[PDB]
């Protein structure tokens, strides 16, 4: 353990999981000196953290440390560098050669010979650097983080671009690229050599010497034309018209057009040697990328031509997904590296291989709960299980309940009932066996057959939300408030956990995913839970829920708005069916 | 003789292997060479490389290297004799592309958990990896091959419940491991049992090692030697679900196997609670985990040759990672495998209003009927294309004058031969998603009905959505299936004729089918909406979606047939039986 007590440093050696307990991995954040400059990412990154379910205020209960000196630039020439941060940094009180300590950096080095330069010694602590280098890389003590601009989203989402995946999957452009060659320096050697494979009809890569001084003072035969040839075309059209990016390496290993390119559904080809992609280690980019190498740049177009037409619909879907689930938001991010380092306490209790690349995602998918794929039900297609055939009744009470209990119970499907005498109506219980729960309310009628219907329906749609009272939701332009809608409308967005049927996983993703504010306006309230937990349905699974068949008011606005500002988006998708049965 | 320098750690695929030597291929596959001249392992190891596709000649044209020295044990290595040996091969080029093969990493006196030999930047595939020995996208973590996996062949034993709960069975445990193994089994008894010293001695009782193994639900691994032992694979073989004690070591294949779903990893310092946290994994886990590991062996464990190919395949997908394998195909059992589905539509995506659906209409000696179905057609809203198919040759199509008046763009196709399969083909003039096709005798749909179905399938992307309603029943008394459609409690189907689908489904029909059931289709000129059901669940593996609370839509003994040759074809029937349909809300 002290042998390796340097650059060495792995989780069994340079990490203290006394301090993680069993229930722990809690977050401690720094105090502001409220005597420094930050940059805004920075202020992003720390709301991201202390909004998150990991933060806590006492050092001595968490086993993890964050910095409160703004470490995401590093390089000497930036004006959001710090000085004097390697004495700085020696000063804390909780510093403890940084053993417990998470960093986040997005970059380091000086204009000759970018490298892993942070500055101050980091000991100890783990550094969550956007471009690492493969072999400065600790293979499961480090995290490698997308590299995001000051205008990434804080909590929203864009959405992605693709809405039409439309085949073949091929568009009017193979190959492109638009961005500034580097007469000087290092590298700009896989920058400079496009041209060689440059061919105007599929793979058009665009290139500029226009960087400052060395505009004219050093330009070499080629300035001129590609000056010429770089002013057609958008940015945010060949982007959005071609099958293949490309993203390679400038002066740093990383860089903003890889997200941009994951924004744009087109399938990256990388060519930034020896980088670890974002969470490498954690997601398969086989699936949603194609690594190249930029010794070979000449034969890229053939191998990218060689790439079949089912294997670019999958990487591009891979793409979406990736950017939609991890790489959205800086919130994202920050919790995605939180949760690569939880992962990494408890090796009986964390994610699989498959949770990470595959529907919903990691973020979403708690190994606390369980780390068996079957007990989730977003996963019973990619094995070949069948969702459970029994589902177990949840009763919240506060006669119609006497007649309502007996209807419930002949069904051939339940196999207990667990009636609730008192929000307490999503925590998970240990008396709920079956993997579907049927959260009843007490003032809701509810046939047997109607009931026996509702689990049929369940069983086919798993991820959703299977219920009968459904309400809409609508944008208000006179207030720029999200509304309500509790009328008969042709189109509908959520569905009331009232008379709903819905995977017993929800109630852990509720009880330990959505913080503790949220609860509490809703317990505050007193109602807004059902809306809530539509909203993490829709949220997780990205499709609407299905209904089938066969003062207070005002509150209700106020809930979808806070929760709307919680997640920064929409959730919700409308929805203009209702299964019957046939 | 020429000692090259010591283990470069810092040495990565983009730094270290020559990319040049391997380019390009159509067949995505790394070329390896065998030198010219040794234990019967390695025999057997150059045997299995000589005897698969990555195996070539001509020296100079070939990516990987594999020198033919006995490097697998290192307790009869003669480091500075192996050093002068690959020194002396002559073709080392300072080791850039060679590969070696290693599973007991290990020395007398020190532990040094790699191999000890100098190679430079040799690429190497070991057995015993710690987190500081192994790089991590250049090395291979290969398992340690025990003789008993071809020596004794142990039963194929279900998984399901066993006599013994925890097993230890090693023999050369250090005192600070027996003692806390003692302890937990004086603490609960009778389900923790440790075996002492190829045969197995209780206390005053004798077990034999290869079948004791099979009455644990679990098998502990400890480190205490070359951080590998080959206990590991007779503990996979055996079934039980391994608990790897070993404080900084990775398990073999760990690049593309999924260990979390096959072992159970503890800390050394937390042996007094592997017993606690083993309570935890609930039964049905332990039924995966015990399938997993019995994959894992009987498919990368069993012989040296699945080592080498599994290490060979591990390079190749590094080296051509766009043509790398699934990670299905790399650790998924072959019952779960069938039972897979691996949609080709994962995105949960819902396309918007702006674009429509390109109307293909299937049209042979019936002109009079197709006017009364593409007048109501066109009156559609979303309408964006509109194809008519002309399957028959004989007649010539109609005068362009007489064609409907219609706002959509129309367009004729004159087909090679009249084949009833033509109307799935994709047509590059198809630039929507949704895809409808409708029959000529189909007149009773409203333009209501078309555009509620379009509006539905936007919800439903990956699946198949049609009108008309059939399902599929079992008859004891034929023992086959039968095709039902008087009676509709149940959907298992809906006919091409009046359905919305994705065109990628029209892609599946005319390439990916199997060639056994397009071409009988098209001969038997019937069944092709019963084919590209079939194709559409089997792909998918998703229900169908009926969208409308009606029957009629037009105004046996062939289609069971079909049904049965096309359960047949498949090794079993991918419908599945569902009773919801969707109406106006
Ligand atoms: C979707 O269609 C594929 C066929 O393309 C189905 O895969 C087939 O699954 C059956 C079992 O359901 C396999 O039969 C088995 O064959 C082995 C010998 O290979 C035999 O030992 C077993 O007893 C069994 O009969 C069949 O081999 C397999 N074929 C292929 C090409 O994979 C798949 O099951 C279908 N999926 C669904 C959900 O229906
Ligand atoms: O014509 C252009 C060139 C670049 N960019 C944006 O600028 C960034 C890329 O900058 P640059 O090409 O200078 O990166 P580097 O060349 O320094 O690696 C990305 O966010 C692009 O979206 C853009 O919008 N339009």
Same mark, same amino acid.
């Given at each position: ?257 890889? @997200?941009?390119? /994951?924004? =744009? $559904? ?10 670890? *992609?974002?969470? &490498? ?120 309940? @006497?007649?309502? /209990?007996? =209807? $419930? ?10 009636? *609730?005498?008192? &929000? ?159 | ?585």
């Amino acid at each position: 353990s002290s042998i390796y007590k340097g650059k060495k440093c792995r989780m069994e050696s340079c990490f203290d999981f006394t301090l993680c307990k069993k229930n722990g991995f809690k977050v401690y954040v720094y105090p502001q000196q409220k005597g420094e400059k930050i940059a805004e990412s920075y202020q992003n990154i720390l709301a991201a953290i202390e909004g998150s379910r990991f933060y806590t205020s006492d050092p001595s209960q968490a086993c993890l440390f964050v910095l409160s000196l703004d470490t995401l630039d590093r390089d000497q020439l930036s004006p959001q560098y710090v000085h004097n941060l390697r004495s700085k940094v020696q000063s804390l009180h909780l510093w403890n050669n940084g053993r417990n300590h998470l960093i986040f950096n997005l970059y380091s080095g000086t204009w000759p010979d970018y490298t892993e330069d942070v500055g101050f010694d980091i000991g100890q602590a783990m550094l969550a650097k956007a471009s690492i280098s493969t072999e400065n890389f600790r293979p499961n003590f480090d995290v490698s983080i997308p590299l995001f601009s000051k205008d990434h989203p804080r909590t929203g989402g864009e959405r992605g671009f693709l809405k039409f995946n439309t085949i073949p999957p091929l568009r009017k452009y193979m190959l492109v690229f638009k961005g500034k060659r580097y007469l000087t320096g290092i590298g700009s050697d896989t920058r400079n050599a496009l041209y060689h494979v440059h061919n105007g009809e599929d793979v058009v890569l665009l290139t500029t010497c226009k960087h400052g001084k060395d505009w004219q003072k050093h330009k070499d035969s080629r300035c001129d034309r590609d000056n010429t040839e770089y002013e057609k075309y958008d940015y945010r059209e060949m982007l959005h018209n071609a099958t293949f990016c490309l993203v390679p390496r400038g002066r740093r290993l990383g860089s903003f057009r890889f @997200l941009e390119a /994951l924004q =744009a $559904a087109c399938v990256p080809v990388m060519l930034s040697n020896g980088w670890e *992609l974002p969470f &490498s280690e954690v997601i398969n980019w086989n699936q949603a990328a194609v690594i190249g190498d930029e010794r070979l740049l000449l034969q890229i177009p053939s191998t990218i031509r060689s790439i079949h037409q089912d294997k670019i619909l999958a990487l591009r879907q891979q793409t979406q997904f990736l950017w939609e689930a991890y790489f959205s938001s800086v919130e994202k991010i920050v919790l995605t590296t939180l949760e690569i380092i939880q992962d990494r306490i408890f090796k009986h209790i964390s994610r699989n291989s498959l949770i990470w690349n595959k529907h919903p995602g990691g973020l979403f998918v708690l190994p606390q709960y369980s780390s068996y794929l079957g007990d989730f039900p977003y996963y019973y297609a990619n094995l070949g299980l069948k969702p459970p055939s029994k589902f177990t009744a949840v009763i919240h009470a506060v006669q119609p309940v @006497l007649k309502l /209990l007996v =209807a $419930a119970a002949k069904s051939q499907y339940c196999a207990q009932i667990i009636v *609730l005498w008192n &929000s307490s109506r999503f925590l998970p219980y240990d008396n709920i066996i079956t993997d579907a729960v049927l959260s009843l309310d007490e003032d809701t009628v509810l046939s047997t057959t109607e009931v026996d219907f509702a689990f049929t329906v369940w069983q086919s749609f798993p991820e959703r939300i299977v219920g009968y009272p459904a309400r809409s939701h609508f944008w208000d332009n006179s207030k720029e408030r999200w509304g309500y809608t509790s009328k008969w409308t042709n189109d509908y967005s959520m569905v009331l956990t009232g008379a709903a049927i819905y995977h017993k996983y929800y109630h852990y993703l509720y009880s330990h995913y959505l913080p503790a504010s949220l609860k509490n306006m809703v317990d505050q309230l007193a109602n807004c839970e059902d809306i809530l937990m539509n909203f993490l349905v829709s949220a997780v699974t990205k499709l609407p829920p299905i209904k089938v068949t066969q003062d207070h008011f005002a509150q209700r606005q106020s809930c979808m708005n806070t929760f709307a500002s919680w997640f920064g988006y929409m959730p919700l998708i409308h929805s203009q069916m209702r299964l019957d049965p046939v | 003789s020429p000692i090259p320098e010591r283990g470069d750690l810092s040495c990565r695929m983009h730094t270290c292997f020559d990319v040049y030597r391997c380019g390009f291929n159509p067949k995505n596959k790394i070329k390896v060479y065998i030198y010219a001249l040794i234990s019967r392992e390695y025999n057997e190891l150059l045997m299995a490389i000589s005897d698969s596709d990555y195996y070539t000649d001509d020296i100079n044209r070939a990516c990987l290297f594999v020198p033919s020295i006995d490097v697998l044990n290192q307790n009869t290595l003669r480091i500075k004799e192996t050093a002068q040996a690959m020194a002396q091969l002559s073709r080392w080029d300072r080791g850039t592309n060679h590969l070696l093969f290693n599973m007991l990493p290990g020395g007398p006196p020190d532990y040094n958990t790699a191999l000890d030999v100098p190679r430079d930047r040799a690429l190497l595939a070991g057995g015993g990896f710690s987190t500081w020995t192994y790089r991590q996208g250049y090395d291979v973590s290969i398992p340690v091959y025990s003789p008993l996996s071809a020596e004794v062949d142990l039963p194929e034993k279900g998984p399901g419940p066993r006599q013994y709960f925890l097993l230890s069975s090693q023999v050369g445990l250090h005192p600070e491991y027996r003692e806390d193994l003692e302890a937990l089994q004086v603490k609960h008894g009778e389900s923790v049992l440790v075996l002492d010293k190829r045969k197995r001695c209780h206390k005053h009782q004798v077990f034999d090692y290869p079948q004791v193994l099979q009455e644990a639900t679990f098998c502990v691994v400890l480190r205490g030697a070359r951080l590998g032992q080959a206990v590991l694979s007779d503990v996979l073989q055996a079934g039980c679900v391994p608990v790897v004690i070993a404080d900084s070591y990775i398990l073999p294949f760990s690049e593309v196997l999924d260990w979390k779903r096959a072992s159970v990893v503890v800390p050394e310092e937390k042996m007094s609670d592997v017993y606690s946290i083993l309570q935890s994994i609930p039964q049905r886990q332990i039924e995966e985990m015990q399938r997993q590991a019995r994959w894992f062996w009987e498919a990368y464990f069993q012989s040296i040759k699945a080592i080498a190919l599994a290490t060979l395949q591990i390079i190749n997908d590094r080296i051509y990672p766009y043509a790398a394998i699934s990670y299905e195909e790399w650790n998924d059992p072959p019952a779960v495998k069938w039972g897979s589905v691996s949609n080709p539509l994962f995105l949960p995506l819902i396309p918007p209003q702006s674009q429509g659906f390109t109307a293909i209409v299937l049209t042979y000696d019936r002109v009079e009927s197709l006017f009364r179905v593409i007048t109501e057609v066109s009156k559609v809203p979303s309408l964006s294309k509109l194809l008519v198919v002309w399957n028959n040759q004989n007649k010539n199509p109609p005068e362009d004058s007489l064609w409907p008046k219609i706002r959509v763009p129309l367009k004729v196709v004159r087909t090679a031969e009249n084949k009833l399969s033509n109307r799935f083909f994709p047509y590059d003039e198809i630039e929507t998603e949704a895809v409808l096709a409708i029959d000529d005798d189909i007149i009773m749909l409203t333009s209501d009905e078309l555009q509620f179905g379009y509006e539905v399938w936007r919800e439903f992307p990956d699946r198949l959505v049609g009108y008309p309603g059939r399902l599929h029943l079992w008859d004891h008394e034929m023992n086959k299936w039968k095709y039902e459609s008087e009676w509709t409690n149940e959907v298992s189907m809906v006919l091409t004729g009046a359905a919305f689908y994705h065109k990628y489904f029209n892609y599946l029909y005319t390439y990916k089918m199997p060639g056994d059931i397009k071409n009988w289709v098209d001969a038997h000129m019937n069944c092709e909406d019963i084919a590209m059901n079939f194709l559409v669940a089997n792909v998918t593996g998703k229900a169908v979606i009926k969208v409308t609370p009606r029957k009629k839509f037009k105004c046996m003994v062939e289609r069971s047939e079909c049904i049965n040759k096309f359960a047949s074809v498949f090794g079993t029937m991918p419908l599945k039986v569902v009773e919801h349909r969707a109406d106006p809300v």
